[PDB]
Design a protein around this ligand. Structure first.
Ligand SMILES: Cc1cc(-c2cnn(C)c2C)ccc1-c1nnc(N(C)Cc2ccc3nccn3c2)o1
Ligand SMILES: [Cl-]
Ligand SMILES: [Cl-]
Ligand SMILES: [Cl-]
Ligand SMILES: [Cl-]
Length: 273
């Protein structure tokens, strides 16, 4: 059919030949995987510097390729573009899937904010620029919400800064970013992503503070249950705080959409001198 034809087209696009990729040094290395430098040889002869994220039955491999094929299709300047996938195999017979991404030398937004409070790192980020990060994230999420794609792990550490200082959402799926209903019922909608966006806005306005100082992760459900939310950052605009506070309304139906949030943020940014 057409649904099957559309899937088969996407699956053709996503896979990269292993010989077109050259691996470099290890950048990061945790439990779930490793991030590495790479070179990707392109159609025009020249090479491109890339980031390579390396991630066990073939059902999960087909599921990975299917999911990768969907993400490959995203095209928006505030959503990270998946360049493609490679599947290398181990000596034991376990497949190692690899995800190829544009290299972003400025790194993740959370680290950038924290560095901005240190002498050697980037200089003090003014209110206009912090709000521009929030607008950029809202635009990326508005795009994903229109395609009925849930991010699931939205946070400042999963937003990446491009060379022009544009922010894009990345690292698609952290107790303190999860909505109250998603902790209770184990269910996740676009309004759960909106909650996470509010928490991400708070990270940006505090220049990288961990959410809910003095509240443990195991204490989080009961804390939210009694109506408590993230406190207004020092020297935060009342209008900005009202926007992020609207993201944490108890009833998910009362939370605004990403399009509504994005307009409110652009208007607030335009009003600043
Ligand atoms: C988009 C994306 C998708 C998947 C995924 C999960 N399941 N399937 C099927 C896929 C295709 C996994 C990871 C990502 C991703 N997004 N961002 C990053 N990283 C590693 C952050 C990064 C990016 C760029 C960068 N440059 C220097 C350092 N950097 C660090 O990883
Ligand atoms: Cl990108
Ligand atoms: Cl870039
Ligand atoms: Cl801090
Ligand atoms: Cl708080």
């Amino acid at each position: 059919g057409s649904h099957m034809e559309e899937l088969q087209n996407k699956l053709e696009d996503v896979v990269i030949d292993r010989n077109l990729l050259i691996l470099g040094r290890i950048l990061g290395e945790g439990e779930f995987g490793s991030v590495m430098e790479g070179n990707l040889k392109q159609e025009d002869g020249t090479s491109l510097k890339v980031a390579v994220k390396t991630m066990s039955s073939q059902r999960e491999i087909e599921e990975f390729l299917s999911e990768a094929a969907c993400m490959k299709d995203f095209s928006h300047p505030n959503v990270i573009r998946l360049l493609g996938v490679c599947i290398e195999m181990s000596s034991q017979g376990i497949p190692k899937p690899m995800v190829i991404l544009p290299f972003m030398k400025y790194g993740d937004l959370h680290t950038y904010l924290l560095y901005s409070r240190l002498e050697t790192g980037p200089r003090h980020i003014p209110l206009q620029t912090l709000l521009r990060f929030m607008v950029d994230i809202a635009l990326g999420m508005e795009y994903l919400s229109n395609r009925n794609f849930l991010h699931r792990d939205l946070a400042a550490r999963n937003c990446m800064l491009r060379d022009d200082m544009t922010v894009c959402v990345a690292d698609f799926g952290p107790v303190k970013w999860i909505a109250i209903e998603s902790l209770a019922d184990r269910v996740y909608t676009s309004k759960s992503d909106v909650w996470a966006f509010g928490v991400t806005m708070w990270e940006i306005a505090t220049r990288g503070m961990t959410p809910y100082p003095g509240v443990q992760n195991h204490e989080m459900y009961d804390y939210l249950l009694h109506g408590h939310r993230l406190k207004q950052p020092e020297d935060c605009l009342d209008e900005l705080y009202e926007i992020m506070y609207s993201c944490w309304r108890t009833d998910p139906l009362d939370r605004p959409t990403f399009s509504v949030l994005r307009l409110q943020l652009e208007r607030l940014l335009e009003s600043l001198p």
